[PDB]
Symmetry: D2
Subunit: 267 residues, 4 copies
C-alpha cells in the first residue's frame, strides 16, 4: 500500500459523490489512518462516512469559525493520540452563492457574496495550513482541489476568481509549509458529476448555463487525449494520493493536472 | 496626438508619484480630455491635480461605497455633458492593510483585512466597469494596474493574491465589456518608487522586508534586458496610453507587460 | 503619424494577402520610410509591392542563405544612405513542408522537413537580429509573427513546434537586442485568411483538416470577446505598428496577443 | 512495489551520474522489468549498467539513425518475449554542441549545430514514440526529461530552445499516444550535478558561465521552498517513476515539476 501508516486529515465530505469521499476511500485502500472534518451537517456526514472501508474520527470544522480553527490542532491530536503527527492534509472545500455562478450575470454578484466565497474557497487554505503545520511531520504534504482558472469561461464566474486566488495562496503556503519539511500542491481536476453537479444539469443554476455545463463537459472529453469520464472521480483521487505519497518529493507550490490532458489541447 | 478627442476617466491619484498621475499627464499631452476620480482626500487631490497640464473635473469615488458607485455614470455624464460618452477608463486603484504585506507573517492576516484589500484592489475593477460600460463608446477601452503575481515573492503577501484575483476578473470583464465593443486589459508593471514605496524603503513595513524590497528592485533592473528605472513611471504610463489608443484593437482580457522584459528572464 | 521618420525593414511579402503586406501599408500611412526584403520570387514581389501607398526599396533575402545574411546590413545601409540606421525590423517569415502540417500524420514528418521548417520559421529570427542589430538605433524595435502554440491543436502540427521554438528564441534575442537599446517582441495573431489559407480551405492540405481549419477559425470568433474577422489582417498590422512605435517602451522578450482575446477564454 | 511486473524501456544512460541510471535503479527497486537503450559507447554502457540492482537487456539506439529506429520495436519484442508489451518508456536523451551553450555567444551557433541539438533533444521524442506505440499496452506511459525553458537564462542558450520544442512536441505525442490508452508527460527537473555538470564547473564550457552555473544552482536551492540538492538525482527519478505508475492516471501532455518548487518562487 502506497500510504502505509501515514496519518491523514481529509476535509470536505458531504455526500458519497464528494471528491473528498473518493479521496478518503483510496487513501484507506493504501493503508492511511484517516482523520476527517466536515461542515454544518454532522449528523448526515457521520452516516455517510460509515461507507468508507474504515471507521475514522470525524470532527466539526467550519472554516469561517475562528474557534473551530483555534481549537483544531488540539482536537486532531486528541483524535490520533499524542506523540503522533499528521503526514498529509486534504483541502477539498469550496463554496460560492448562486449570485456568483451560472446564468446570473457576472456584474450582479454583490461583494458580501463573493467575499464569503473566497473566504471558504481560498482563504481557508491558509487557515487550515496555519492550524495544522504545527502538528505535521517532516515529509508531510498538504493538497487542495482546483479547477483551471487561467482562461475565463461561461457560468463558472466568480468561482473562477476564487480559484485564481487559491492557486496564488497555495504558492505562499508552500513558503510556510516549506519550513516544516512539508509540500503543498493543488490538483486541477476536470469536471466531476457530484450530486451538486447533477442538479445544475436538471435546472438548478438556470437554463442557458445547464447547456453550457453539458457543453463544457462534452468538450472536455473531446479535448482530453486519454478521455474524461465525469462519472468517475477515482483518477482524481489517485492523483491526490500520489501527492500524499512519498513519490513526488520535489514538488511544491504547484498544480498537478488530473484532467485527461484537456488543458494541454485547444481542439 | 495619440488620444485626440478621446474622453477618458482616470482613477487612483493621491500624490504626483501615483502611476495614475503620470497616466493622466501623458494622456493629456496626447489630446485626451480627462475626467478624474479620487478617494477620501478630495481637498488634497484637487490641489495635486492642478499640476496636470490641463484642468480636468474631479469626482469623488470610494469603490466600497454602493452610492458613489450607483451615481457615478450620471455625475460623469454631467462632468462631460450629455450626448457624449467615455472612450477609456483607467483603474489604477489598490489597497491592502499592513497585516497582509511587509515583514508581517502571511498566516497572521485576519480575513476582514484580506477581504477589504480584494474589494478595493480586485472586486472594484468590475464595480467600475459595471458603472461605466453603459456610458462607453464602441471602440472603448478599460485598463487596470497589475503586478505580476504568477510566482510568489517575499513581502508582497496577500497583495499578490489580490492581484491574481484581479487578472481573473479582468478576463470576465472582457466578456462583458465585449458586448459594448469595449476592450479590457491589464498592465503588469515593474516596481515604481512612489511616496508609499519610498517609505517602505525608510522603515515603514519592517526591516527584513525593506532589504527584500531593495533586493527585488535591484534584481528587476538586472533581469530587465532593456533595464528598469523604478524612479521613472513614464514608460508604464506610455504603455497604458497605447492600450487606450486605437492601436491594439484586437487585444482584450489580457496583460501587457511594462516591466522592461524582466518576467521573461530568470537571471 | 505614429511612425514619423522611423526607417523600418519589413520581410515576408509574397502576395497582398501577406500579413507583412498589410504591416507595410499601415506603417507607411503612419509615416515610416520602409525597406523591404523578399524571397525567391523577386519579379513577382516587386510588382506586388507597387500597390503599397509608397515606393520602397526591395532586397533579396533567403534566410537559409549565409551570403544574403552576411551582406544584409551593407545592402540595407546602401538602400537608406550611410549615416542612417533602422528604427524597426519585422520578421513575418515562416515555412513548413506539407509532411509537417494538415492531414498528414504527426509522426511521419521526416526530420529534414521539420528542421528546414524551424530554420526558416524560428532560427532566422536570430539570424536576422544578428545581421541588423549592428545598424539599429537605440530605441529601435524588432517584431516577429506568432501563432499561439501553448496548447496543441489538430493540423498545425510541426508548425506548432516551430512556433514554440520562436517564442523561446525571441527571449534570447531580447538579451542581445537589449545591448543596443532595442526591444524584441512577438505578435501572436489569430488566423488570417491569406491566399495560402484559402487553398487549405479549397482542398490543399487534405479533407479532414480543412474541416478542422474551418472549425478552428469559427471557434476563434466565438471565443473572441470582441470577435475575430479572419478576412481582415488590419488589426494584426496595427498591433505590430504599436510595437514599432515608441508607445510600448518597456516591453521586450514578450508576446502581445492580437487575437480578439480568444486565448483568454475557454468557451 | 510501485512498478510491479511493469515492463519499461529506459534510454539515456552513459554514466552512473546520468539521471536515467537513477531512473532505472528506483524503477527496479519498485519491481519493473527493464529494457535499456544506449548510444555510441556500448562497451562502456553495458559495464556501467551492471551496477543496477538487476541485469537488463541493452540495445543500441542512436536516434539520428533511421535504421536503429525502424528495427527498434522488433528488437524490443525480441528482448522481452513475443506476446508481451511495454508499460513504459523513458526519454532521457539530450545533446547540444558547445557553440549552442555556455560562454560562447548566442548568435554564433550555426544552424547545423542547433538542428542536430533539436534532432536529438526534441524531434527524437516523437521518433521514439512512433517506434514503440505499436508495442505498448493500454495504461502505458511515456516520460521525457525537461529543464524549464519558459524564461530565458544565461549560458543555457540554444538548449533552452530545444526544450521549448520538446514541451510542444510532448503535447502532440499525447494526441497520438492517447489513441493507444497511453499517457505522455515530461518532468521539469532542477539542475543535477552529472559528470558533465561537474566538468562545466571545472573549466569546460568557459569561465563566465562556470560562475553562472554555480550562481544558477545556488539560487535554485535558495528559491526552493523545500530546497534543492543538485548532488541527489533521486527525487527526480522518483517523480519519473510516479508518472510511470498507475497513480497519475488522468495526466497527459503535461510537465510535472521536480525542482523543489523553485519555478513557483521569484525570490
Ligand atoms: N466537482 C468538480 O467538478 C470539481 C472540479 C475541480 C475542482 N473541484 C473542487 O473540489 C472541491 C470540492 O468539490 P466537490 O465537487 O467535492 O463539492 P462538494 O460539495 O462535495 O465539496 C465541497 C465542500 O465544501 C464544504 N464547505 C462549504 N462551506 C464550508 C465552510 N464554511 N467550511 C468548511 N467547509 C465548507 C462542504 O461541506 C462540502 O463538503 C471544491 O474546491 C471544488 O472547487 C471540483
Ligand atoms: N507601485 C508599484 O510598484 C506598482 C507596481 C505595479 C502595479 N502597481 C499597482 O498600481 C496601482 C497604484 O499604484 P501607485 O504606486 O500609483 O500607488 P498609489 O498609492 O499612488 O495609488 C493607489 C490609489 O488607491 C486609491 N484608493 C485606496 N482605497 C481606495 C478606495 N476605497 N476607493 C478608491 N480608491 C482608493 C488611493 O486614492 C491611491 O491613489 C495599484 O493597483 C498597484 O497595485 C503598483
Ligand atoms: N496566416 C495566419 O493565419 C497566421 C497566423 C498567425 C501567425 N502567422 C505568421 O505570420 C507570418 C506570415 O504569415 P502569412 O499568413 O502572411 O503567410 P505568407 O506566406 O504571406 O508569409 C510568409 C512568408 O514566408 C516567406 N519565406 C518562405 N521561405 C523563406 C526563406 N527561406 N527566406 C525568407 N523568407 C521566406 C515567404 O516569402 C512568405 O512571404 C508567418 O510567420 C506565420 O506563422 C500567420
Ligand atoms: N542534468 C541536469 O541538470 C538536467 C536538468 C533537467 C533536465 N535534464 C535532462 O535529462 C536528460 C539527460 O540528462 P543527463 O544530465 O542525465 O545527461 P546524460 O549525458 O547523462 O544523458 C544524456 C544522454 O543523451 C544520449 N545521446 C546523445 N546523443 C544521442 C543520440 N543521437 N541518440 C540517442 N541517445 C543520445 C547520451 O548517450 C546520454 O546518455 C536530458 O533530456 C537533459 O536535458 C538534465
Ligand atoms: O461544482 C463545481 N464544479 C466545477 C467545475 C464545473 C463548473 C464550470 C462548468 C462545468 C464544470 C468547479 C467547482 O469549483 C465546483 C464547486 C463549487 C463550489 C463548491 C464545490 C464545488
Ligand atoms: O506599492 C506597491 N508596490 C508594488 C511593488 C513593490 C511591492 C512588493 C515587493 C516590492 C515591489 C506592488 C503594489 O501592488 C503596490 C501597491 C500597494 C498598495 C496600493 C497600491 C499599490
Ligand atoms: O497560414 C497560417 N495560418 C495560421 C492560423 C490558422 C492555422 C491553424 C488552424 C486555423 C488557423 C497559423 C499559421 O502559422 C499559418 C502559416 C502557415 C505557413 C506559413 C506562415 C503562416
Ligand atoms: O547538463 C544539463 N544541465 C541542465 C541544467 C543546467 C544548465 C543551465 C544552468 C545550470 C543548470 C539542463 C540540461 O538539459 C542539461 C543537459 C544537456 C544535454 C545533455 C544532458 C544534460
Amino acid at each position: 500500500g502506497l500510504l502505509d501508516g501515514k496519518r491523514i486529515l481529509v476535509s470536505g465530505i458531504i455526500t458519497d459523490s464528494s471528491i473528498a469521499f473518493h479521496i478518503a476511500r483510496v487513501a484507506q485502500e493504501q493503508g492511511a489512518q484517516l482523520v476527517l472534518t466536515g461542515f454544518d451537517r454532522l449528523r448526515l456526514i457521520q452516516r455517510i462516512t460509515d461507507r468508507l472501508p474504515a471507521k475514522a474520527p470525524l470532527l466539526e470544522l467550519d472554516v469561517q469559525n475562528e474557534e473551530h480553527l483555534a481549537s483544531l490542532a488540539g482536537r486532531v491530536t486528541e483524535a490520533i493520540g499524542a506523540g503522533n503527527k499528521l503526514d498529509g492534509v486534504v483541502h477539498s472545500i469550496g463554496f460560492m452563492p448562486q449570485t456568483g455562478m451560472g446564468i446570473n450575470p457576472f456584474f450582479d454578484a454583490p461583494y458580501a457574496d463573493v467575499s464569503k466565497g473566497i473566504h471558504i474557497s481560498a482563504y481557508s487554505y491558509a487557515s487550515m495550513a496555519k492550524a495544522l503545520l504545527p502538528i505535521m511531520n517532516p515529509g508531510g504534504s498538504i493538497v487542495g482541489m482546483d479547477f483551471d482558472p487561467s482562461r475565463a469561461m461561461p457560468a463558472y464566474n466568480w468561482m473562477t476568481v476564487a480559484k485564481s486566488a487559491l492557486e496564488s495562496v497555495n504558492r505562499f503556503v508552500a513558503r510556510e509549509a516549506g519550513k516544516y519539511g512539508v509540500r503543498s500542491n493543488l490538483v486541477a481536476a476536470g469536471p466531476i458529476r457530484t450530486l451538486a453537479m447533477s442538479a445544475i444539469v436538471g435546472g438548478a443554476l438556470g437554463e442557458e448555463a445547464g447547456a453550457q455545463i453539458q457543453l463544457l463537459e462534452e468538450g472536455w472529453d473531446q479535448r482530453a487525449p486519454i478521455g474524461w469520464n465525469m462519472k468517475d472521480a477515482t483518477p482524481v483521487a489517485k492523483t491526490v494520493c500520489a501527492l500524499l505519497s512519498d513519490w513526488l518529493p520535489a514538488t511544491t507550490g504547484d498544480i498537478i493536472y488530473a484532467d485527461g490532458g484537456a488543458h494541454t489541447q485547444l481542439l
